[model samples]
Target: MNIFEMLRIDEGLRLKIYKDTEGYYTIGIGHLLTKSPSLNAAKSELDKAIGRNCNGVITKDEAEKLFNQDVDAAVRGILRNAKLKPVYDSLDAVRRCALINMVFQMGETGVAGFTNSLRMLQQKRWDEAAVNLAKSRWYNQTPNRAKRVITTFRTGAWDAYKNL
Candidate 1:
């Protein structure tokens, strides 16, 4: 079997976050922990994956390929477990994509915890939901990205921030 298949068999494919044996948060092919690595550490790990120097960088094509594959898996999990298939389908393209991005960042179960925001979404209170989303630790973690998602949902327009 290929390496990935072997890892799937050994580590198993965990789509959602869980604590490992040592109680470290783990997910998605055994990536990440509750205490995330520093930027340099993450980049070094990526370098190891791509089999280049410590300064190895991924091209846009490589990044896009990886993102598409991962995001598809994430969306499938959200559709199956989050029970928001209808709500997700009802959203416009930008809003739907924003939900997908949120799921990508937070996992199905994590995104599911946005009960208040989801309630607002269910009620079609777009502005309120966006406000709720913006007032979260997720926004604190990534202001630009979270703002873009919130703004898209609130205003139904693509607001790209080049300075992110």
Candidate 2:
């Protein structure tokens, strides 16, 4: 009912361990477990999910479990951040999911740093928000993915799932 499918389309997947753009060891659907939380549970879970010591390789089935947990944590973490509550609560599932993916990919701190851009969004100034994103680093760095997300933000029309 939510966005693991959508995130997969954006985040993609891998069966073998590889480093991310920033060089942290990652596996599965862009699952940066090593950089996530602590290696404590994340590593053990990865190993258990693989039914092996997870020696830099994982099966799709095994990866799916890790992907689910990552998506779940991102969703919960995004909602629990508090500062975005009003704007987040006011958005539709589509836009909300878009923002969640933003947080997932950018991490909370990165996403939170786009204050003016986010302010435009919070104010419901769709066109202005789109312009704001157009000038943003994410829009330039990851244009294709960022553009798709922009489309959702610019979807504009208020939906039934909004704060009503």
C-alpha lDDT of all candidate models, in order: 0.61, 0.74
Choose the strongest candidate by TM-score.
2
Q: Model 1 TM-score? A: 0.61
Candidate 2 has an lDDT of 0.74
Instruction: Point out where model 1 deviates above 4 Å.
Output: 1-61, 161-164
Q: What is the C-alpha lDDT profile of model 2 across 31-59, one tens digit per residue?
A: 87566545455657568656778656788
Off by over 4 Å in 2: 35-52, 156-164
The lDDT, on a scale of 0 to 1, for candidate 1 is 0.61
Error of 2 at 21 (Å): 3.0
Roughly what TM-score does model 2 have, to 2 decimal places? Answer: 0.80
Write out the backbone clash pairs for model 2: none
**Residue-level lDDT tens digits of model 1 in 90-122:** 776656766776776667887888888987887
RMSD of every candidate to native, in Å, equals: 10.6, 5.8
Determine which window of 10 residues in candidate 2 has minimal summed lDDT: 155-164
